[PDB]
Symmetry: C3
Subunit: 213 residues, 3 copies
Amino acid sequence: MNYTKFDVKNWVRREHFEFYRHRLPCGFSLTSKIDITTLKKSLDDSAYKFYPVMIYLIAQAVNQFDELRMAIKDDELIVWDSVDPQFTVFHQETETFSALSCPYSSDIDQFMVNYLSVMERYKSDTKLFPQGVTPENHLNISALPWVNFDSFNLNVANFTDYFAPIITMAKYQQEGDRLLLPLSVQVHQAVCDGFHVARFINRLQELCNSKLK
Amino acid sequence: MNYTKFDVKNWVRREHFEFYRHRLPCGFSLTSKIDITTLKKSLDDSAYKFYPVMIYLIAQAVNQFDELRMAIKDDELIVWDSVDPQFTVFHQETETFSALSCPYSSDIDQFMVNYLSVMERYKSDTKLFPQGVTPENHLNISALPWVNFDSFNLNVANFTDYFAPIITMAKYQQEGDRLLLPLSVQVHQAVCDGFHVARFINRLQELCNSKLK
Amino acid sequence: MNYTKFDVKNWVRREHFEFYRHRLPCGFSLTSKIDITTLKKSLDDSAYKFYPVMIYLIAQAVNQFDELRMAIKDDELIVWDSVDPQFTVFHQETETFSALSCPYSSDIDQFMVNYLSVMERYKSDTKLFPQGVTPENHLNISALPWVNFDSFNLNVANFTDYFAPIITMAKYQQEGDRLLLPLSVQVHQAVCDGFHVARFINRLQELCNSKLK
Ligand SMILES: [Co+2]
Ligand SMILES: [Co+2]
Ligand SMILES: [Co+2]
Ligand SMILES: [Co+2]
Ligand SMILES: [Co+2]
Ligand SMILES: [Co+2]
């Protein structure tokens, strides 16, 4: 199987986990701006498009940290070996969105082939989940390309035990000499602390400042 | 009657609506900065005050999009022909707020007459709802003039089926050559997507950049 | 006793309180940037560290306003004479956090002695609440020093009657000639309005712009 049961008994977060899961269930959202000045340059020297690269980079970062790939399966806590991005797609024609996923791959060119393929096949499918059930080993990525925002937060009526992170991007902006992308991260406190989210963001930024291949 | 029953059966958002209403009930808030550099100029060339104009402009924008004027009435989904602003008023003397509403009008001078009239009559009424029951065809507007903010979010214990948008303004600020007003929009996902909110904001900005009359 | 029963009967917020407590239970979070340019200078001319001073300053501000020190005790509404800060501590070694508190004092040097003492004694205690039960007369302060954010919000599954404010700080940043610290304030609407939060923030800023002793 593609996940491994986690050793809660010996975890340094064991008390945190029970506290934030059942005693005081909560989570948080944070919005920060990622500098994509370097990445804009890289993309310019290539044929990649922005959105597919950001999915790639975000999935890559998530796949490096266990605490972003936890879930409850059969009442037990597991870590997925790896997770695939579930991203939103906007249909111009109906002005509605759909959520799709494709397999992640550490090889950026194979990821692009996966993405183009999924898009080829469901570009005109206006169902909300054209592919049917969402694979359990997922992360959620959404984009609001039409507007910049300083904050985004999802108010959810019930989030018991849903630990996959939700990342939302807005339209980027030029702030002085920099091109900044607002990114909102929303997690559950049972599995993730402020530290973990900050480590994800610092890692993402690093990725944005590095060669693609 | 002043509303029309909506055709859910043939709506391109029909699956979205059921999903976000009953399967995974949620909403979101977003905060963005509206450039009010042009509007400050217009106001300077006139006798209008800032707050009443922002209510006006926001109500005007809301009244152009159906998805911001939905509600459940008798278990059915309706669109109001038009909605009136319900705005907050601060009382200096008690340091408490009240919520008022007046009829919207596409004629800015009649709107001002409505506003001055409502204010005349309830300026000193410290009840929370001096007028009694809030008309069902409303939008909510609030202002935090004493402080600038980058984000605002309302955490609500229960929001089942309340689809009127909540807009909150902070104190504006000079950012370089621009005067920016932080505005927070909070909607329910059953009726509104990221697209819709972004379209409201882009429309509001346009309005701010145009002649008043 | 260290609290006083509040006169709800004659309060100008009496209707607000019942409304926001039981009819439409809610709260809000707001994130604003505090200019700590002056304070950086003061700290430079001294031996104080940043975090302990911010706890100090925030607790000082809270202790000046009643509406930030309310609670329900025995079904009644009370105001604490004073509240102590409950702050988070990060352990590098385990990469987990703990929450501690020490007695507040209006004398900054005695506060520092209290803080160093509590830290001395529990620096290596990785329990979530090394001291055991949190004193009821508390405010919550947390810090995310590793990342800057524009917004922070806690999504809480149940907040019935918890009125202590939650303040969260991010990493500060240089914005032009200024050093700004993002601060998020999260309150319950039964006890606090936008006015109150804005008054807390304006007061905090004032404090940051003043001599320490
Ligand atoms: Co339990
Ligand atoms: Co791996
Ligand atoms: Co249903
Ligand atoms: Co019309
Ligand atoms: Co009651
Ligand atoms: Co006192």
